[PDB]
């Protein structure tokens, strides 16, 4: 069926999913863009409703897998979309309720722990790098919204691709100690170069937000503190960039490379 | 004390117009925002024409003026001129510098980054911060790429002032590399060598195209080796600035004693 009026009750409800409070109440979230819908489906997330605009391809309709397919008019589409140039494919997926307690880590895991909230767009970039390097788990700050239009768009759907859990600092500390994982803190003044850590047997990298840096409690908790060399005028890199360097160094060692 | 209070003051409007590249071209001037960015421009020998100080500037911020005109801005006048939600309290209007590629001398085994095409100012800025961090000897960017936008300056943390970055033409870039006798390493998603497998101990020019388009086939023919960043999940691409940082720090790893994979 099709819905024409932007004022239709179903459309208003779809547009309301732009707000975190409405997503948490209804248990649904909107995924905008063909690429992002593909990743949410490939990740096995439960599609409830597929929204198709006027210029969608025929292959787009076959993505529904039996879910409701609602064709929306451009006027209706404009209201639902979080974009200047709305996408022709959108999906309403069920919001997953997941607990860090349900997590069991495979062999020699690569874990990234982000402490504190970081500038917008940093998380999306980090998830892309984490997805690329094959990270097994990413812990983020307790207040992080993993289902916002922003994180979905900035991660290009990589947010769906891996286990990401927003947790309080104390929950993170407890989980890591339970897992008996060596903690490696990335700090500007770390005693060792980050190439020199041994990441072949599994590791949790500790990474702080630019505003405050790593709390001293976490620096002390680390088995090793490591640094990224800065040989120029700049004294630090963006936290997302630091994350990518660490992850790909750990992947380099898992691919046959030796610690420096 | 020369004070500007109203966002309606024509000078404030003119200062705010410097955000646009056309205005920078016409005036031959650009705005540098931030005490640390201003000091860096000054350390790099750039010419300061006008120092801007907000209501919360330090007393010693005045000691940066040299011979420049000093303008004290109200809080709301500062908000109009600034490119940030939380404006800096020290800003400087400098003369656009003239960069000559001829005076660049490279030693043996230099680390070079060649950025073909364009993307956003945020991306270029972050690439320059990584080049500064990794100690690149030279960065070449596409021909009409803007090195002195507020974004580039902010995202580079002012590293754009002391870093050897040059706007250059595709053919000029190609010839210069040929003149320098540097092996070209093209970073592409299709390359059949992981980037850790290249040997960057003796010098290298990395070739990086925009994430959207890619790399022109004329440049793909000039590459000695083609390398990729490995991608272990569904995505096969990362932001271009992230790829640049990964390549540069892999060369630095090898230069610090690490061996190619």
Author numbering:
A (entry chain A): 1 to 260
B (entry chain B): 0 to 260
Question: What does the article say, verbatim?
Answer:
However, the deposited structures contain either methylthioadenosine (MTA) or adenosine (ADN), two SAM degradation products, bound to the active site of the enzyme. Therefore, the study of the structure of the T. thermophilus HB27 enzyme in the absence of any SAM derivative was undertaken. The structure of the enzyme from HB27 and HB8 differs by only three amino acids, and apart from the slightly different orientation of the L30-like domain (see below), both proteins are identical (Root mean square deviations are 0.690 and 1.472 Å for TTHA0275-MTA and TTHA0275-ADN, respectively). The enzyme crystallizes as a dimer, the asymmetric unit consisting of two dimers. Dimerization involves around 1535 Å2 interface consisting of CTD α-helices α7 and α13 of both protomers, organized perpendicularly. The dimeric state, confirmed by gel filtration chromatography, and the perpendicular interface organization observed for RlmR are hallmarks of SPOUT enzymes acting on the ribose, in contrast to the parallel dimerization mode adopted by SPOUT enzymes acting on the base. The CTD of RlmR adopts the classical SPOUT MTase fold, with a central core consisting of a β-sheet made of seven parallel β-strands sandwiched between seven α-helices. Except for a slight movement of P188 side chain to allow a CH-π interaction with the adenine, no major active site difference was observed between the T. thermophilus HB27 apoenzyme and TTHA0275 in complex with MTA or ADN. In the absence of RNA, the structures of RlmR apoenzyme (this study), TTHA0275-MTA and TTHA0275-ADN show several different orientations of L30-like domains relative to the SPOUT domains. This reflects an intrinsic interdomain dynamic, which is also predicted based on a normal mode analysis performed on RlmR.
